[PDB]
Amino acid sequence: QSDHVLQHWTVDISIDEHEGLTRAKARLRWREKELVGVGLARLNPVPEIGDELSVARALSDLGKRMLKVSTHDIEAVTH
Numbered sequence: 001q002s003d004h005v006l007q008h009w010t011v012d013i014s015i016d017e018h019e020g021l022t023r024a025k026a027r028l029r030w031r032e033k034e035l036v037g038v039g040l041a042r043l044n045p046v047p048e049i050g051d052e053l054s055v056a057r058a059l060s061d062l063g064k065r066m067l068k069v070s071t072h073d074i075e076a077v078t079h
C-alpha cells in the first residue's frame with residue numbers, strides 16, 4: 001500500500017463584531033511562515049450570517065494571498 005504522508009495545519013479565525021459590522025482575520029502559521037487574510041461584512045445583512053460572510057471573505061483573501069506567496073516561492077527557485 002503506497003505511502004500517504006499526512007500533516008495537519010490550523011487556521012485560527014478571529015471574528016470581531018463591532019458597531020454593526022463584523023471583521024474576520026484568518027491566520028495560518030506553518031513551518032517558518034505566517035499569513036493572514038481579512039474579510040468584512042454587515043453584522044445583519046441574523047448575526048450568524050454576518051459572521052459567516054466575513055469569514056468566507058477572510059478565507060478567500062487568505063487563499064489568494066497564499067497562492068501569490070506560493071508563486072513567489074516557486075519563481076525564487078526557478079528564477
Ligand SMILES: [Cl-]
Nearest residue numbers: 040041042045
Ligand atoms: Cl456585507
